[PDB]
Amino acid sequence: SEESQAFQRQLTALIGYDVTDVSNVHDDELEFTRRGLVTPRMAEVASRDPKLYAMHPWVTSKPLPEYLWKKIANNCIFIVIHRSTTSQTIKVSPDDTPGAILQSFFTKMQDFVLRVCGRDEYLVGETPIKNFQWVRHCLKNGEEIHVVLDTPPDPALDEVRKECDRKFRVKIRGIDIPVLTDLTVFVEANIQHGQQVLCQRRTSPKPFTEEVLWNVWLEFSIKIKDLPKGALLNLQIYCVRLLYYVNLLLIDHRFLLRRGEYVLHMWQISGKSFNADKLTSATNPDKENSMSISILLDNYCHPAEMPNQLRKQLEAIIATDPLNPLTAEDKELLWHFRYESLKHPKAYPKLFSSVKWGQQEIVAKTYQLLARREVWDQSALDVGLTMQLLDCNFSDENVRAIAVQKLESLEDDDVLHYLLQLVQAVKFEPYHDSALARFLLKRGLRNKRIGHFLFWFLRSEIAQSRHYQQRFAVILEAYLRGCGTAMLHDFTQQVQVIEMLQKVTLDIKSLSAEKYDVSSQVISQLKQKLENLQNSQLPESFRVPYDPGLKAGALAIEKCKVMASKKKPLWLEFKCADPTANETIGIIFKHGDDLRQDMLILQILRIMESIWETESLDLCLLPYGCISTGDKIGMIEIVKDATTIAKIQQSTVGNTGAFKDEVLNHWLKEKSPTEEKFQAAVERFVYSCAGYCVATFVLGIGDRHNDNIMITETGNLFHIDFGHILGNERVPFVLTPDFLFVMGTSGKTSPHFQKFQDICVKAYLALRHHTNLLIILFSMMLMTGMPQLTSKEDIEYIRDALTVGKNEEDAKKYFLDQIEVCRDKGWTVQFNWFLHLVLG
Ligand SMILES: COc1ccc(Nc2cc(-c3cnc(N)nc3)nc(N3CCOCC3)n2)cc1OC
Asked: Which residues are noted in the entry as ATP-binding?
């Protein structure tokens, strides 16, 4: 269809990849998935309520924080309402439905609805107004709720376009590389299931040349019948170091044994190791420069009491952390007692790791074992436990499915919290179509906020990842067909803006080189280049990718500028597109840093906050919006009235930092109109400082330069630029005499310092109860998100930091000890960091 191809071509530009391209595939798996996702899509599009979907209400079922309910006081809430005239305030009960409030507003005066001024947000459906996330946000900021009486959006804008017992063996013919001194080479063939190697065979070393021919049958111990679904054939070339690797599913999406001739273009590695890239079933799209290996496959297949002491033995095995390796005896015990182990959900990840997947009999029993789901099905949802089963350790679709089952109950605000990690978890899936993928698809189509972030998280991987881009493109294309024409329009104009600006970002960086800072000609060029973009192409308005609630209008070209960083990032400001708002929308465009890392780190910060909320703790973290738009390129939210802690020192002392503890406090008063807001700043600081002290310490990002820490004029302090630190005289975290001086302590105790410690302890202990969740989120992040090869060692930093197994008291002191390490060297580390900046 003429108009059907233009619609597909439209999808291609939004996706950033062409899913109609079969050039890179040795089979139909991707295409089979594109069609497979057709059903679960149209099913969700038909399920969602048009009105609620159009207004995408953002709500939470979580209990109101214990500290905030105190703010409720009289049990009355002030809510302002304006249409063109009326400023009149109406007092409503916390449990009152927005609709019932209209009936109350119709009495003082329904086809009209309540919207939030300056943003696109709607209070709608039946939920208590206390359950609306945006409302809770105003309270925490000590802000009054301002709502505009408005007409509901037309749901018609959301309409979607009409739609053998023999042993296994493989013949290695040879390898070929287009181009390159007397070296040696051999191929390694592994049969892998969930990172576990079932059988291994290597060829005989042959002289390394542009072509090497073997034609040898590599025979394996494993029988064809014993091959578990999701099993990978891992082919690896060896120089004794690994050169290239490629993967082929021995059993396809159709449950068929893979058969016939295959020529696979492999991936090249980097020598100096857990990486999600090594798992990909995708062949290298570049056939020009990539090594290839030819193989042949021909196999014909059409298809009660537990002794007290041992109980104590596995219970301890169940109780150990996710990163605790299971010994041989560990697994045998778990398995023989599996029916007992099935009563403990927390033991599942370890139990299914005790399964021998290279045996059909065992796998079958494993299914008989899953046949009784009672304990698991009825158990309270545990994310850290659920996600544990979604990682690289499990290739079995049925095992992974039970995890996806639990996720079904997360609803909306929890999905957003874990959305990023879940999207990354797709890389662990053996097949393109999967329960997890279908889960993400459905949830994205059901909610616009979840769908918006789904879009960008997928585009991020599609752009900079040649390994998973094909699978993700297929998933994104699926979503784009069900999201409606309105969103398709929003994404379109968001993508245009992003492309125009990135071009400017890179063109600006190419000048001024690495150093020498900013030329007057570089300032001018940007000013001109922007007005040239504002002239024609740039959309009159666009939705802010990291905050879809925000609609950005025309640029402020006078407010824009190039930053002093050696990476010459852009500082951009847009006028608010919504007339019901003055304050501009700040955004930073940077190249040369990998913002996928920043992205992941920031998402964990938001997760730590949620944990602290249930514990009735508000640490005032400031997880600013960050979106990776491509390779070493992306956008960053600008927190208003915020400056670096380094600039505050230079504003007083001078070029190179020397002491001056008092400077910190001096700045806070200067930026405080009234001591009332100064004492409020000190309060905001002591909490925020505590938050980032505990959070950063756990993630191992605790030790940072003075220039990577910022503070708002209102006292809120927050870290930035998490990209390099994870790969690059340590200090547990940053705690400085200048920070202490604001608390009243000098290298000695103060009322605020005691407050500080009590906060840290309560915050640090509240995380340890979640220890497993943090461990798996952390390890996953390293595997999917860290280009630098993640090892068993790096992932184990968070085990020590969280003091696993240590007494809650023993841990309480352990953290109070880390604080003591800070005062021991006050400026020592920061002074070296300042010395490290020059060299070297
Ligand atoms: C007031 O002075 C400055 C204020 C900020 C910066 N630089 C950066 C640098 C970065 C940054 C963030 N992420 C990464 N990867 N690299 C850099 N982010 C910000 N902001 C984001 C949060 O809201 C505040 C702004 N600012 C530099 C300054 O002087 C050189």
From this structure: 586-595, 621-629, 718-726
Q: Is residue 626 part of a domain?
A: yes
CB 767 within 8 A of CB 611: yes
**Centroid of ligand 1 to alpha carbon of 565 (angstroms):** 9
Residues 237 and 309 placed together within one structural domain of the fold: no
- Cβ atoms of 264 and 175 within 8 Å: the answer is no
Question: Cβ contacts of residue 387 below 8 Å, gap of 6+?
Answer: 403, 418, 421, 422, 425, 773, 776, 777, 780
- The preferred substitution site among 585, 629, 649, 720 for testing ligand 1, maximizing ligand atoms within 8 Å of CB, is 720
DSSP H or E segment with residue 81:
strand 77-82
- Angstrom distance (rounded) from CA 601 to CA 759: 22
| Token code pair at residue 76 | 């009355």
Please list, in sequence order, all residues whose beta carbon lies within 8 angstroms of the beta carbon of residue 152, skipping any fewer than 6 positions away.
51, 54, 55, 111, 112, 113, 122, 124
Annotated binding site for ATP: 586-595, 621-629, 718-726
The token pair at 399 is: 């095992």
502 and 429 in one domain?
no
Q: Cβ distance 411 to 417 under 8 Å?
A: no
| Helices marked H in 265-396 | 308-319, 328-336, 338-341, 348-351, 360-370, 374-378, 383-388
User: What's the number of domains the chain is made of?
Assistant: 5
Question: Do residues 523 and 561 make contact, with C-beta atoms less than 8 angstroms apart?
Answer: yes
Residue 130 and residue 70 share a domain: yes
Q: First vs last Cα of the chain: how many Å apart?
A: 63
Length of the chain measured in residues:
840
Domain range enclosing 655: 641-831
Q: How far is the CA of 3 from the centre of ligand 1 (A)?
A: 45
Q: Dihedral angle at the C-alpha atoms of 424, 427, 430, 436, nearest 10 degrees?
A: 20
If you take atom 30 of ligand 1, which residue's CA is the nearest one? 564
Give the residues surrounding ligand 1 with Cβ less than 6 Å away: 564, 588, 590, 593, 598, 624, 636, 638-639, 642-644, 647, 710, 720-721, 723
Round to whole Å and give the CA distance between 236 and 245.
4
d(CA 623, ligand 1 centre) in Å: 13
Domain of 390, CATH number, reads 1.25.40.70
Q: Could you tell me the distance, in angstroms and rounded to a whole number, from the CA of residue 599 to the centre of ligand 1?
A: 15
Last residue of a domain, one of 436, 457, 484: 484
Identify whether residues 611 and 701 lie together within a single domain.
no
Q: How many alpha carbons fall within 13 Å on the CB side of residue 174?
A: 12
Q: Which long-range contacts (CB under 8 A, 24 or more apart) does 239-242 make?
A: 239/183, 239/184, 239/185, 239/208, 241/271, 242/269, 242/271
Phi, then psi, of 78 in degrees rounded to 5: -85, 120
- Domain termination residue (choose one: 134, 163, 192): 163
CB atoms within 10 A of CB 179: 6
Say how far apart CA 555 and CA 535 lie, in whole Å. 11
Using the atom order of ligand 1, give the atom closest to the CA of residue 564: 30
Q: What sign results for the dihedral spanned by CA atoms 81, 87, 93, 99?
A: negative
Bridging pattern class, strands 717-719 and 642-644: unpaired
Helix (H, G, I), strand (E, B) or coil at 147: strand
Please list every residue in the chain followed by a chain break, i.e. its C lies more than 2.5 Å from the next written N.
109, 163, 180, 239, 272, 303, 581, 728, 747
Same domain, 307 and 277: no
Compute the chain's Rg from CA coordinates.
29
Write phi, then psi, for 536 (nearest 5 degrees).
Answer: -120, -75
Overall resolution, Å? 2.7
* CA 157 distance to own-chain centroid: 30
- Please tell me whether residues 443 and 489 are part of one structural domain: no
Residues 6+ apart with CB under 8 A from 629: 456, 459, 460, 463, 498, 502, 545, 595, 635
Bridge pairing between strands 260-265 and 292-297: antiparallel
Could you give the angle at the alpha carbon of 642 between the alpha carbons of 654 and 562, nearest 5°?
75
